Amino acid sequence: SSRLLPPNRSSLERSLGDVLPAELPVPLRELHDPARCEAALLPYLAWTRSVDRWDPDWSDEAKRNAVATSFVLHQRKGTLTALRQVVEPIGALSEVTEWWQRSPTGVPGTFEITVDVSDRGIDEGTVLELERLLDDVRPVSRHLTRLDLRI
Amino acid sequence: LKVQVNSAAQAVGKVAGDISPTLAGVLPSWLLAPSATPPSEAAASLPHLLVLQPLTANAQPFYFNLNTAAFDALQRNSAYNWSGQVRLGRRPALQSV
C-alpha cells in the first residue's frame, strides 16, 4: 500500500503503491457456510451435504436451511422428528397417526402411516411431490405407500 | 508452445514491429582515458629523491621529494644464494644455486 512505503515517496510511488498490490477478495471460507454461499454455487454444497431432494422453485431461505439442517435430517432418517422438518418449504405441521388411536390392533399391514399435511401457500398442484419427497425419510419396507393429505 | 507462441510472436512482429533499442549510455572517449599530462609534483622546484613508476606506463608516477614523502634512510639488503652441502670428512661444499 501507500502506507507500506517509506516516508520519502513521490506521488508516483504513492500511486503505484495503491495499484501494484491490487488486493482481491478471498471467497474461500464462504463455500461451506450455506448462509454465506452465493446463489449460483449453492447446489454444489447441497451435493456434498447429500441433500437427496431439491427443487429449483424455493426461496433461498427454503434452500439454505435444507443444506444447513442436512446433518440433522440425515442423522435421524427413521424418526418422525426429522420427518417433521423434511417438509420445511411446504409449511405444514398438523397431525400424525400412531398405533393406539385405532382400536382394532392396527391396520392389516401393521400400521403404515397416514400422516396429515396442511399447506396454505400453494393450492394448485403440490400433491405429487409429497409421496416422493418423503421417500428418503421413509424406510424401504417399514412403511407402505399409503398416504393421507389435506389442502 | 515453442512452436505456436513463436509463430504468434512472429505474426505480431510482422504486423507491428518492435521499437528500436535506443541508446542513452553513449559516453565520449574521455571517461576511460588517462590524463597523460604530468602532475604538479613533477614540475615542482625540488629535485626528486626517488621515483616509483609502474608497468602500464600511462599511470601517474609517485615522486619522492620534500613535498610528498622525503625518506631519510635507505636499507638495501641483498643476499646471494649459496647452498651448503655437508661432506663428512671435510669442509661443506658451497654451490651458487
Partner: protein, 147 residues
C-alpha cells in the same frame, strides 16, 4: 517490486489461511465454529458466563483441540434405535438399572425390550416403566410396537 512481492505474499498467505479454515485438521478459533454449526455441535461452557463480582469472570469455553474431538465424534453417536445395540443405549434414561438386551418375536410390527433394574431383587418397578417409554416415542422408528 518489494511491494508486489510482499503484498502478494500476504494474498498467498490469506489463501493458505482460508484453506486451513475449511479443513477439520487445521481450522481453529471461530473457524471450527463454522464446521461446528454445520454438524449441530456447539462449544462447551465449563464455567458460566455471567459474574456476580466486580472483576468480569471470562466465559470459559473448551479449547479448539477438544472441538476436533467433538466434531469427529458427531457421527458415532446415539441417533436412532435401529438395531439391538441401539435399543439398549437409547434405554439409558433411568439410573437404577444394569444392562439389557432386545428381541422381536414378529418381523413386521413388534419389538421387545425386557428391562431389569437392580434395586432390590432385580424386578422392574412401574415407575421406571414409563421412564423408558418417555424416551422411545421420538428416538425409535415411528411405527414400532415397542412392548
Amino acid at each position: 517490486l518489494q511491494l508486489a512481492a510482499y503484498r502478494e505474499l500476504l494474498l498467498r498467505a490469506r489463501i493458505n489461511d482460508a484453506a486451513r479454515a475449511v479443513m477439520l485438521a487445521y481450522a481453529s478459533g471461530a473457524d471450527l465454529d463454522q464446521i461446528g454449526a454445520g454438524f449441530n455441535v456447539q462449544r462447551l461452557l465449563i464455567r458460566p458466563a455471567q459474574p456476580e463480582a466486580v472483576p468480569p469472570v471470562e466465559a470459559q469455553y473448551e479449547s479448539d483441540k477438544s472441538l476436533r474431538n467433538r466434531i469427529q465424534l458427531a457421527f458415532e453417536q446415539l441417533s436412532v434405535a435401529g438395531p439391538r445395540n441401539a435399543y439398549i443405549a437409547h434405554a439409558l434414561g433411568a439410573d437404577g438399572r444394569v444392562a439389557d438386551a432386545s428381541a422381536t418375536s414378529p418381523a413386521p410390527c413388534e419389538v421387545l425390550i425386557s428391562v431389569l433394574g437392580v434395586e432390590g431383587n432385580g424386578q422392574a418397578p412401574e415407575a421406571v416403566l414409563q421412564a423408558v417409554r418417555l424416551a422411545l416415542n421420538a428416538e425409535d422408528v415411528r411405527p414400532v410396537a415397542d412392548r
